[PDB]
Write an enzyme that holds these catalytic residues in place. Structure first.
Site, PDB file in Angstrom:
ATOM      1  N   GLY A 150      16.764   3.579 -10.624  1.00  0.00           N
ATOM      2  CA  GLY A 150      18.006   2.582 -10.458  1.00  0.00           C
ATOM      3  C   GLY A 150      18.343   2.905  -8.785  1.00  0.00           C
ATOM      4  CB  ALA A 151      20.605   1.729  -6.851  1.00  0.00           C
TER       5      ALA A 151
ATOM      6  CB  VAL B 285      14.734  10.439 -17.944  1.00  0.00           C
ATOM      7  CG1 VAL B 285      15.986  10.167 -18.355  1.00  0.00           C
ATOM      8  CG2 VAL B 285      13.759  10.865 -19.437  1.00  0.00           C
ATOM      9  N   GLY B 286      14.438   7.139 -16.451  1.00  0.00           N
ATOM     10  CA  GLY B 286      15.151   6.263 -16.208  1.00  0.00           C
ATOM     11  C   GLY B 286      15.301   5.895 -15.206  1.00  0.00           C
TER      12      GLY B 286
ATOM     13  N   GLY C  35      17.952   7.578  -7.402  1.00  0.00           N
ATOM     14  CA  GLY C  35      17.216   7.311  -8.261  1.00  0.00           C
ATOM     15  C   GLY C  35      16.459   6.838  -9.222  1.00  0.00           C
ATOM     16  CB  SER C  36      12.835   6.902 -10.152  1.00  0.00           C
ATOM     17  OG  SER C  36      12.006   8.909  -9.459  1.00  0.00           O
TER      18      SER C  36
ATOM     19  CG  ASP D 284      32.073   6.954 -11.391  1.00  0.00           C
ATOM     20  OD1 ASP D 284      32.331   6.044 -11.469  1.00  0.00           O
ATOM     21  OD2 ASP D 284      30.598   6.715 -10.833  1.00  0.00           O
TER      22      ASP D 284
ATOM     23  CE  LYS E  24      20.274  12.173  -7.898  1.00  0.00           C
ATOM     24  NZ  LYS E  24      21.382  11.827  -8.651  1.00  0.00           N
TER      25      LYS E  24
HETATM   26  C1  LIG Z   1      22.066  10.164 -13.905  1.00  0.00           C
HETATM   27  N1  LIG Z   1      20.812  11.642 -14.215  1.00  0.00           N
HETATM   28  C2  LIG Z   1      20.840  11.429 -14.458  1.00  0.00           C
HETATM   29  C3  LIG Z   1      20.363  13.133 -14.404  1.00  0.00           C
HETATM   30  C4  LIG Z   1      19.806  14.162 -15.704  1.00  0.00           C
HETATM   31  C5  LIG Z   1      20.036  15.352 -15.690  1.00  0.00           C
HETATM   32  C6  LIG Z   1      19.835  16.053 -17.156  1.00  0.00           C
HETATM   33  N2  LIG Z   1      19.016  15.274 -17.522  1.00  0.00           N
HETATM   34  C7  LIG Z   1      18.471  14.553 -18.429  1.00  0.00           C
HETATM   35  N3  LIG Z   1      18.452  13.699 -18.859  1.00  0.00           N
HETATM   36  C8  LIG Z   1      18.245  12.395 -18.950  1.00  0.00           C
HETATM   37  C9  LIG Z   1      18.747  11.886 -17.552  1.00  0.00           C
HETATM   38  C10 LIG Z   1      19.384  13.481 -16.937  1.00  0.00           C
HETATM   39  C11 LIG Z   1      20.519  13.259 -13.339  1.00  0.00           C
HETATM   40  C12 LIG Z   1      20.162  14.670 -12.791  1.00  0.00           C
HETATM   41  C13 LIG Z   1      18.494  14.784 -12.674  1.00  0.00           C
HETATM   42  C14 LIG Z   1      18.341  16.257 -11.858  1.00  0.00           C
HETATM   43  C15 LIG Z   1      19.556  16.342 -11.189  1.00  0.00           C
HETATM   44  F1  LIG Z   1      18.567  18.054 -11.023  1.00  0.00           F
HETATM   45  C16 LIG Z   1      20.723  16.613 -11.286  1.00  0.00           C
HETATM   46  C17 LIG Z   1      20.385  14.953 -11.983  1.00  0.00           C
HETATM   47  N4  LIG Z   1      20.900  12.573 -13.147  1.00  0.00           N
END
Ligand SMILES: Cn1cc(-c2ccnc3[nH]ccc23)c(-c2ccc(F)cc2)n1
Ligand SMILES: Cn1cc(-c2ccnc3[nH]ccc23)c(-c2ccc(F)cc2)n1
EC number: 2.7.11.24
Length: 329
Positions: free
Chosen positions: A28-29, A25-26, A31-32, A142, A48
């Site tokens: 950075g610093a 999905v994306g 994490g992915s 933030d 994540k």
């Molecule tokens: C920056 N960031 C986006 C997401 C995120 C969450 C839900 N849907 C999404 N779709 C695209 C990014 C995203 C997370 C994340 C993922 C898993 C976690 F358990 C906790 C945070 N971090």
């Protein structure tokens, strides 16, 4: 359960069999994230992976802080945890943390000018999430469009220069700011959804404060006498003094209730800003407000924030938090 290995855009991923069809999905610093299908629940999920969670004491404490916060957040308008896992079998092996949540489609930055009913429902959902977050004595700090996950149904969850949404007390580095720094950010977001423009697109922290005071006016003597810093009082008192602008004039065309709410959120004195709980009772949310479904959070212990511990102590606490995790039903 059985794990399967896989490479995705250089990042390595070791996830249980139940998560299939990974798909960057994306990154950075910090994490992915990957999108995935959860075979157990039928759900699309985000997974994540943390980048080097125990590289240092700073990283180890940040990792612990994120997992504790995510395990605590249980609210329709705040991101929480479906799952947390490591491919490790014991403490000695443990070096990777994966976090799982309901996949969201886009951010509020991507959805952009919205209609007034859409603005009512999005700002309502933010404030309902913030009431819950603030009730735990947590300050977001933030809040910005990029930290608001929105799906195609307009359902919103709390997760573009950051300074644009920052309360003036953070521009001048006040060390005792309160939870209404988050209400200032909501006011800036609500402005931008009504008008289609950043309310205060500062080029830096000095320009950022000058744009703010242009709208809300330089402080009166009631606020100036609460500024302990002599350099900050000298600086603010030395600016060319501008009056509070009429918000009816600046937001020409908007719902007058949206204008009234904006005036209540973008007060310069942080002690006079509306709270999340007060803002939900405002007439602008009459279509959406329900006082028996705007829940508060269980108490949240962040005494760990005042502790100085070894990397392995933060690591073992984090391990402890992975093992005690109970999924939602
Ligand atoms: C920056 N960031 C986006 C997401 C995120 C969450 C839900 N849907 C999404 N779709 C695209 C990014 C995203 C997370 C994340 C993922 C898993 C976690 F358990 C906790 C945070 N971090
Ligand atoms: C150091 N510092 C505190 C405050 C501050 C802001 C809002 N509410 C407050 N309540 C008690 C202090 C305080 C400000 C400030 C005030 C006006 C500005 F235009 C710019 C910064 N600086």
């Amino acid at each position: 359960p059985t794990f399967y290995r896989q490479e995705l855009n250089k990042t390595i991923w070791e996830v249980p069999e139940r998560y299939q069809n990974l798909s960057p999905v994306g990154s950075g610093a910090y994490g992915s994230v990957c999108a995935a299908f959860d075979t157990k629940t039928g759900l699309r999920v985000a997974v994540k992976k943390l980048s080097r969670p125990f590289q240092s004491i700073i990283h180890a404490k940040r990792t612990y802080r994120e997992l504790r916060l995510l395990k605590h957040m249980k609210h329709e308008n705040v991101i929480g945890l479906l799952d947390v896992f490591t491919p490790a079998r014991s403490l000695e092996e443990f070096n990777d943390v994966y976090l799982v949540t309901h996949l969201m489609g886009a951010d509020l930055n991507n959805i952009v000018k919205l209609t007034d009913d859409h603005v009512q429902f999005l700002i309502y959902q933010i404030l309902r999430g913030l009431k819950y977050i603030h009730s735990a004595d947590i300050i977001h700090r933030d809040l910005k469009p990029s930290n608001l996950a929105v799906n195609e149904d307009c359902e919103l969850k709390i997760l573009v220069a950051t300074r644009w949404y920052r309360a003036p007390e953070i521009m001048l580095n006040w060390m005792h700011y309160n939870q209404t720094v988050d209400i200032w950010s909501v006011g800036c977001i609500m402005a931008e959804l009504l008008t289609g423009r950043t309310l205060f697109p500062g080029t830096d922290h000095i320009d950022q404060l000058k744009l703010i005071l242009r709208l809300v006016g330089t402080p009166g003597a009631e606020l100036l006498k609460k500024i302990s810093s002599e350099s900050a009082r000298n600086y603010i008192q030395s600016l060319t003094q501008m009056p509070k602008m009429n918000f009816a004039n600046v937001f020409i065309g908007a719902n007058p209730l949206a204008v009234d709410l904006l005036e209540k959120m973008l007060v310069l004195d942080s002690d006079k800003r509306i709270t999340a709980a007060q803002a939900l009772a405002h007439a602008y949310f009459a279509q959406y407000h329900d006082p028996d479904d705007e829940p508060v959070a269980d108490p949240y212990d962040q005494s760990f924030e005042s502790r100085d511990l070894l990397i392995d102590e933060w690591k073992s606490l984090t391990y402890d938090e992975v093992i005690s995790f109970v999924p939602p039903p």
